[PDB]
Every structure is written in structure tokens, then in C-alpha cells.
């Protein structure tokens, strides 16, 4: 039996949570209580199988069990079609109510009143809103969500304790979710071959000192971990993640110097810690690449005898000595390299043909460096909010077909690059910026996927995972596009209206001038300012 093998390895507590997540991600509209029942059933039944591994129905695969309980058009179908069904019925942008915390004391009452139902409530509410959230991590998040209610519902000021943590958790969760979503899209839309390269790139950067052989292994195991979490095999995802976190730490010496602190801590902490570690120190005298990948007489041979292992050895070798480069860059270079080997090793003298393959890189490297230098100059020259509006406008013109809420949402997140990254030294900027941008752009891509309007966005999204940022950056304003025919709010709130309006304002006269925007923007802000001052406000808002 299988249920048991998991229940055992994961423990009831975590089992129970995961199983919840699994469900709330699959059916996002279905009410809270409705799930908890299904959970508890599954949980009781598991226990039976723990007692009698040869009991009735314990012979089944988790998918079948889960799908079944859930089913109490997809349900008219059977494994595996059925599961793929639910997997493809996942909604990235549910019409689910805005999430809002009732007054502190109200929560602090409920937390002591019913501590379990309370956490299950949290997992439930997040999971249905982030159907691709990294299940294991969501546990970390939940424990740290408990830890704040434990403390802050037990102090002088609750509000100035609790809320400040919850603002940090929402932020962090939003990032993790978005980051994970990229992982899942990479896998599902570009296949594992592609994710593998990504991993090989990133891990070679986290763990420079590690021999290729080790990195390949890690990449395998990790790819397995994610594949599962994205295919909705969360239980196994978490176990496998654990087993991996346990592996890494045993062999620490051969991986990184940095892991010690991480490896010392509990199951949940360390998996996150590790995920988040700093890059190990760049090893000393590493023979220049060119020797083995340009000067060698056996390039054209090794690319024949093992293109994958060779190109991997390459990606590895280049990545480990470039923590300054984005992953997506490194991938591009890798692609350029593959490409060029292809053409050259079909020539008269290949040694000659490919000999200059590094010259090809200068462009691909520079194109990003400039772009970052410039909008970091810009960022510091504008500050984050204003900075967001420039991106807003820039992009809105590029893709005036995209829904306003999406435009706002994405723009704003593009905005944070500046504050996130521009404070770092150049050395650490690009991998910060570009790879963050690659996440944000993926949010666009998926939100867009749902309800497609703009062949340009689609082109960029589907054509190549790695070249998206350049594809988008490239885009000039859309000429084809046919122009489109409260006071008691927080700053962040006011911002999102103003911005929302800004988009409509651009959609109205795309061939606007920054000045005749300044003019309309201001006008309207003044309008709202006056109509806030009061009388019969609504009578004022008459226009
Ligand atoms: Pt959220
Ligand atoms: Pt090698």
C-alpha cells in the first residue's frame, strides 16, 4: 500500500495539512468545512491501512483515492485522464472574495477558541488562491503563522505585534507562490529537459565547489520533487523534498560551506533555509572554459558522443564561474553555444567555424547589463511608486489589449525590481533583477493564458521561456490598437486606483505625450482631492 508509506514518513500532522492543500488547490470554490470532512475521512482510512497494510482499498494509488473523495465532467473520467482534468481545471485568478483580516481581537478570540480549525482555515484560504503554491513551504508558512498568533495574542499591543508579521508573511507568500508558479509552468509548458537546465544553472551557482556528478544528482532529485508538486503529488513532493534536504546535509562538505547553519535546524526550517542559501565562495584557479569548449580538438566529438552530458558539463562550468549572470542569460548562452556547435560541426573545418563562439556572447551579456543600469538610474531618480507608473505606461502601450487589473498588478510588480535589486552592487544586480522579472512576466503570461487577448503577449510567452524578458522589452508601442472610447483609503490603496485610472487614461489616447498625461493625471488627482473635501461628495463626483 501507498497511503501508509506516506502517513508514516510525513506524520499525521503534516499528512493532514498536505491532504487539505491538495484538495483546496483542486477545488478552489468548494467551502472550508466541505473539505475538512474529506480530509478527516482520508486520514481515518489511512490509519486503517497503517494497521492493516493489506486492508480493503489500501492497494489504491493516492490519485484514485483523492479524486474519488473529491468526486463525492472530471468525475465522469478515470485515472489518469481524471487527474489531468483537475490539474487543468486549476484557476490562477479565481473570482474568490478579496481576503481581509477582521479586527485583531476578533482573530485573537478565534485563535484560542479553536487553534486547529484556525490554521486549517489559513492553509485553506491561501491554497485555493495559490493553486500552484509550493505545498511543503506552505507548511513552513503555516508554522510561522501559528508562531505569531501564539506570541502576539499574548502581549500589551496585539495590533503592533501581530499585524506587522502578517504583512511580512503575505508579502513572502506572494513571492514564494509566484516563484513556484514559474517552476510549474517551466515544467508543464516547456518539459523537464528545460527545467533541468534551469536547475543545473542555479545550483551550479549556489554550489560552485560541487563536482558536476553531484549537481546532476541534485538536479535529478529536485526535478523529481517539483514535477510532483506541480503534478499535484504533494505528499510525495514533501517526502521527497525531506529526503533531499536530509541527503544534502549528510554530504555537506562536498556541496557548500554555507549549509551548516541551515542543516542544524528542524525539518521544515532547513528545507527553506537550504532553498534560500547564499552562493558558496568562487573556487580559486579554475581552468578557463575556452580550453575544453573552444580550443579542444574533441568538441565536435564529445557533442556527438554525448551532447547532453557535454552541454551540461558546459552549463555547469560556465554557471559556476558566473554568479554575476542571470540563469536565463546562462541558458541563452548555452543555447547559442549548442546552436553554433550544431552549424560548425557540419562544416569543412569546424575548429575554425566555432572558434569565435564567445564573441557571440558579448551582445547577449550586454543587452541585460545596459537595461538594468538604466532603469536603476531611473528608479533612484523616481522612487518606487512613480517608477511603477512609467512601467505601467510603457507596458500598457506595448499591450493595450491586456486587462487593466492585470496591467496594474504586473506593472506594480515590475516596479519592485527597483527597490528589491537596485541597492545591490552591479555584481549581484542582474541575477536579482532579470530572474525576478522572469517570475513577474510569467504572472502576466499565465493571467493572460486564462483569457487571451494579445497575439504579441502570447507569442512572447509561448515562443521561448528563456527569451521572454528580451521579447517583451523589445516590443514597441502597438499601432494596430484602436483607442478606448475612496477618500478613506490607505496609501497603497489610493495608489492602485490612481494607477488603474492611469491605464484607462493611456488606453484612451495611446499617442499621449508625457506632458499631456501629467496634465490629465494632475487634473483628475485634483478632482478627487476636491471631491474628498466634502459636502454631498457624490453630488461633487458628478462628472
Ligand atoms: Pt494571496
Ligand atoms: Pt566535463
Numbering used by the authors: 5 to 76, 89 to 501, 513 to 570
What does the paper say about this structure?
Here, we have studied the reactivity of HSA with I-picoplatin, solving two low-resolution structures of the I-picoplatin/HSA adduct. The HSA structure in its adduct with I-picoplatin has been refined to a resolution of 3.9 Å. The final model, which lacks four residues at the N-terminal tail, residues of loops 76–89 and 501–513 and a few residues at the C-terminal tail, refines to a crystallographic R-factor of 0.293 (Rfree = 0.327). The platinated HSA structure is almost identical to that in the absence of the metal compound: the protein retains its heart-shape due to the assembly of three helical domains (labeled I–III), each of which is divided into two subdomains (A and B) and to the presence of 17 disulfide bridges. Although the structure has been determined at low resolution, it shows unambiguous evidence of Pt binding sites. A total of three Pt binding sites were clearly identified in the Fourier difference and anomalous difference e. d. maps. Pt is found close to the side chains of His146, Met298, and Met329. Occupancy of Pt centers have been fixed at 0.50; B-factors of metal centers are 72.3, 82.9, and 78.7 Å2, respectively, in line with the B-factor values of coordinating residue atoms. Met298 and Met329 are cisplatin binding sites both in the absence and presence of fatty acids, while His146 was believed to be a cisplatin binding site only in the presence of fatty acids up to now. Although solved at low resolution, the new structure of platinated HSA clearly shows that the metal compound binds the side chains of His146, Met298, and Met329, suggesting that the compound reacts differently with the protein compared to cisplatin.
